[PDB]
Design a binder for this molecule. Structure first.
Ligand code: FES
Ligand code: FES
Lengths: 110, 109
């Protein structure tokens, strides 16, 4: 039906870093969990892109994932969460509210 | 302005890789250009974020730059293009058509 673009922060930072990083919090497995879940559905594979990014400024809330054009921001995402997001949101067009940290704009921005 | 999220591919690949990369095509200078624009402009930071990414699968037309929520895809962006994109697009709200390679969906989809 419509194109959806998923951005997963995979920014890594040293272990004792003040802000920590999404990678340290497992964001790389989240990115990979998305990839294999999309390449597994003929309809999603042709209407959904998953891109790895550097820090998006919401580290305390990592792993951070933002879905455009929706502008939905997810936080503290775990690999086991990917499935529900893909089914309920990417397909059903309904955001998984328990993980949403912001909408229309980044967390903290006015 | 409004709110705009700019994504600049800064993916790089070793010299032997056939596809090369936006980073080899000068995408890091583009990114830094945008970042110099965000600090040097009075109101842009109020409605704008720039994010560096890995490959977005439009390598032949790199440097690739996508702007959301719009869903506008730019190709072959040079540092010297940033300014016109910032003023004409990020503020004015109108895409610099000579660099647009797609809208609403990735190139070739
Ligand atoms: S490290 Fe992921 S948002 Fe900062
Ligand atoms: S390396 Fe930039 S789009 Fe592929």
């Amino acid at each position: 039906a419509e194109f959806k673009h998923v951005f997963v922060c995979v920014q890594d930072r040293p272990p004792g870093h003040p802000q920590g990083s999404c990678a340290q919090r497992g964001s790389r497995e989240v990115f990979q969990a998305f990839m294999e879940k999309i390449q597994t559905d003929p309809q999603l594979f042709m209407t959904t892109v998953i891109t790895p990014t550097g820090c998006m400024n919401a580290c305390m809330m990592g792993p951070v994932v933002v879905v455009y054009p929706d502008g939905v921001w997810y936080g503290q995402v775990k690999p086991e969460d990917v499935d529900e997001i893909v089914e309920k949101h990417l397909k059903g067009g309904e955001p998984v509210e328990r993980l949403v940290i912001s909408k229309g704009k980044p967390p903290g921005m006015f």
